[PDB]
Amino acid sequence: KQSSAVSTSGNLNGGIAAGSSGKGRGAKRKQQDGGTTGTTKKARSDPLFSAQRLPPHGYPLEHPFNKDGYRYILAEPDPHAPDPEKLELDCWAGKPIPGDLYRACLYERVLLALHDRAPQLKISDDRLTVVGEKGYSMVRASHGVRKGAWYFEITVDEMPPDTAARLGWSQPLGNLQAPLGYDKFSYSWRSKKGTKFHQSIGKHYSSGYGQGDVLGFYINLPEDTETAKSLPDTYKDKALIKFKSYLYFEEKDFVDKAEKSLKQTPHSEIIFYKNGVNQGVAYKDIFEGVYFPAISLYKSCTVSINFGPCFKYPPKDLTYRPMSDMGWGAVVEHTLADVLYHVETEVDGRRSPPWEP
DNA sequence: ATCGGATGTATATATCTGACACGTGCCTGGAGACTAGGGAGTAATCCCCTTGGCGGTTAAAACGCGGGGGACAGCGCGTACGTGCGTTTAAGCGGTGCTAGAGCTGTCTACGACCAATTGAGCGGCCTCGGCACCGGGATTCTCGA
C-alpha cells in the first residue's frame, strides 16, 4: 500500500526490478565454525537434518506453508555447483556457475511433502500417516507427475464412523484446506463407500470401500506433447529467505484457473484397485497441468501413502512407475532446473539437444 | 520484540580405578535354659480438685470516629559492587620420615556397693503478723497549643 518499493518484510529483501540481480542479502559472509555443519568430502553423513521422529503425530513448527500462490521449499548452502578442475592456462575458459543454492529435499525417500500441508495437518513418520482434528484438510506427496503412467497406494490404519478420509490426485491450485475434490482440479475417492468425488460432486460410478483397505491407485497421463502441444519450458523462480532460524527458498506457483472448457488430456485415465483387485476406472476426463497424489483428512483419519518396491498387490506392467521412481526423476529434473537457471544468469548462451525427449 | 554471536552447559565416549561388593576364619555376644524378687498390676478407699452452675460489676471489649502519620510509590543520583581480565600465590599431591601419643594388654587396689543398724535433719502441719497490696489524696512532671 506504499509504492513499488522494498518488500513487505524488513527481515529479507530480494533485488527488485530496479535492483536487478540483487541476490538475497541474508546471512553475512562471515560465518562461525559451528562444528555440526562442518561436514567434509571424506565424511558420510546426510546434511539435511531430519527432525526427531515421534510415534504420536506432530506439526512442523517453523515452516510457512504455501499461500497466495507462493511455494516454499527447503534450502541448502551449496557454495559452488561443482565445476572445480586444474588451473587451465586460459583463465577465461570455464564458468563456476555459482548458484549458491539447491532444492535439496529433507527426505530419505519420496514422501508426503511437509511444505504443502495445512497448519492443521499432523504426520507420524512411524508410518508417515496423516491425521487431523477439525473438519477436512489436504496433504500431498513430494513428487508430481507430468507424463506417463504410474501407480501408488494408500494404506488405511483407522476409520471410525465419524472418520472419513478421501484419497486421490490433485493439480496445483488445490487449496490444501479443502477436502480433495472441492475444486475442479482434484479427483478423489471418499472412504466411506467407494464414491468418486470431483468438483465436490459425488458419483457412485465406483466399487465399495472397506475399513482396512490397502487401495492401489493407477493413473496414466499422456506425454507432454499431448499435454501442451507446445513448449513445456520450465523457467523457474528462486528466492532466498532466512526464516526465523533456517534458510528456505520461495518460488511462484500457478494462479487460479478460470478454465470452464473441457479439453481432456488425450488417452489419460485413472484406475482404482482394492488390494490390487480392479475397483474400476474413476476419471477418464483429466484436465491439463501436473498432478500429485493427495490425501484429505476428516476428523481424526489415519491413512498413509506408499510406493512400489514394498508393495502388496502390484501390477506387473513394465511401463508404470512407482512413487520413488518419479520422485527421484522430478528431483533430478529440478536439479537440472537450478543448473540451467544459474547458467542463464551466470554464463551467456544456452543449448539443448534434438527436442523430442 | 528478534536475531546473531558468545558463551556456558548437558552428553557420549573411554579407561582407571579404587572404593566396594563379596567371601573367610575366627571370635563372643546372642541365644537357650534356669532362678529369684519384687516392680508392676489390681483393687478397694479416700479426697478432693474439678468441673459444673448462678448472679452482680465493670473493667474491658466492641465499635465508631477523625486524622495526623507513615507506608509506600515514585524519582534522582551515586557510590559501591559485579566482572572480566590482568597480575601473583599459596594450595594441593605426594611422598619422605619420626615419633608422641593414641591405643592396646596386664596387674592390683582402693573404692564405692551394699547392707545393716541408728536418728536427727528435715518435712508436713499449725499459728502469726508485717511487709505488702490497695486506696485516697496530694504533689510532680510530660505534652500539646502559644
Side-chain angles (χ1 to χ4, degrees):
Chain A
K1 300 165 185 172
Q2 310 329 290
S3 70
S4 65
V6 195
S7 315
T8 78
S9 76
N11 308 271
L12 198 40
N13 184 11
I16 324 295
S20 280
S21 88
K23 182 82 170 190
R25 193 189 179 91
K28 318 305 162 183
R29 280 300 198 183
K30 292 163 91 202
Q31 294 252 339
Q32 284 80 237
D33 61 338
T36 314
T37 315
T39 47
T40 52
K41 285 251 172 162
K42 54 140 182 162
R44 204 81 270 170
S45 279
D46 178 278
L48 310 95
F49 200 92
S50 288
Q52 297 291 321
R53 304 333 302 157
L54 260 54
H57 285 249
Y59 275 131
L61 72 170
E62 293 279 13
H63 297 286
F65 307 136
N66 55 3
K67 48 176 185 306
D68 72 272
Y70 205 53
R71 283 196 285 108
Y72 167 83
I73 53 173
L74 188 70
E76 293 305 318
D78 302 88
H80 176 35
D83 293 297
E85 320 294 329
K86 302 87 191 163
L87 178 47
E88 183 164 18
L89 55 95
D90 183 38
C91 64
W92 182 219
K95 266 309 212 175
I97 310 297
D100 271 305
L101 66 87
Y102 183 52
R103 300 150 166 258
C105 45
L106 185 49
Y107 274 131
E108 67 277 345
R109 306 291 301 278
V110 192
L111 296 187
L112 293 164
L114 321 179
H115 308 169
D116 313 318
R117 62 199 288 178
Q120 304 181 3
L121 192 139
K122 302 177 293 299
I123 59 155
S124 74
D125 293 27
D126 65 339
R127 274 193 36 85
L128 206 80
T129 47
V130 285
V131 173
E133 49 257 61
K134 269 88 67 176
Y136 273 94
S137 197
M138 181 159 52
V139 74
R140 67 173 295 268
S142 310
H143 83 94
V145 57
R146 202 181 66 259
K147 67 96 176 179
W150 67 286
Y151 179 83
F152 71 95
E153 79 174 10
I154 311 283
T155 301
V156 187
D157 305 285
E158 197 182 55
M159 204 268 286
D162 205 7
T163 288
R166 279 166 56 157
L167 320 162
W169 295 260
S170 62
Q171 180 159 143
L173 286 58
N175 47 3
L176 298 157
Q177 209 69 80
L180 178 54
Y182 190 65
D183 53 352
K184 64 190 175 191
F185 305 102
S186 159
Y187 316 80
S188 57
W189 284 49
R190 171 184 58 180
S191 302
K192 279 312 182 183
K193 184 265 173 187
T195 41
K196 327 173 307 177
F197 272 79
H198 164 238
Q199 289 198 113
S200 171
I201 306 175
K203 308 94 179 166
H204 314 306
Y205 187 73
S206 45
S207 315
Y209 166 82
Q211 195 179 25
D213 278 3
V214 170
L215 300 167
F217 293 73
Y218 191 70
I219 176 170
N220 175 35
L221 317 175
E223 296 276 351
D224 300 332
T225 67
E226 304 294 322
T227 304
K229 324 162 303 303
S230 43
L231 196 69
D233 191 300
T234 58
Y235 178 74
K236 296 294 208 310
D237 178 25
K238 287 201 285 279
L240 293 82
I241 195 167
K242 257 291 186 185
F243 214 83
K244 181 174 292 184
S245 290
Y246 205 83
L247 72 162
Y248 301 103
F249 291 153
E250 296 294 334
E251 322 196 325
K252 295 304 293 181
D253 212 11
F254 320 98
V255 62
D256 285 327
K257 275 183 285 197
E259 190 63 89
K260 302 304 166 182
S261 89
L262 200 49
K263 300 180 305 181
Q264 171 196 350
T265 41
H267 328 307
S268 159
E269 77 267 17
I270 289 173
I271 312 168
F272 198 106
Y273 294 171
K274 180 171 168 178
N275 298 331
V277 166
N278 185 23
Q279 282 204 1
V281 300
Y283 301 86
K284 181 64 189 177
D285 179 74
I286 293 300
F287 185 61
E288 63 86 24
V290 304
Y291 283 87
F292 44 77
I295 283 172
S296 195
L297 55 87
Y298 187 41
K299 297 175 305 191
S300 46
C301 312
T302 309
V303 293
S304 80
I305 203 174
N306 185 84
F307 54 101
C310 47
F311 210 79
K312 191 149 45 177
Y313 308 100
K316 302 319 289 165
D317 167 56
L318 75 170
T319 77
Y320 88 107
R321 49 185 86 96
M323 185 161 63
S324 66
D325 289 77
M326 179 80 260
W328 48 247
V331 162
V332 173
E333 278 186 328
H334 290 299
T335 306
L336 315 169
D338 295 344
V339 170
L340 295 202
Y341 185 78
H342 308 142
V343 158
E344 293 166 5
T345 299
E346 205 265 358
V347 57
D348 182 74
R350 258 202 298 104
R351 162 83 274 185
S352 193
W355 190 10
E356 176 170 350

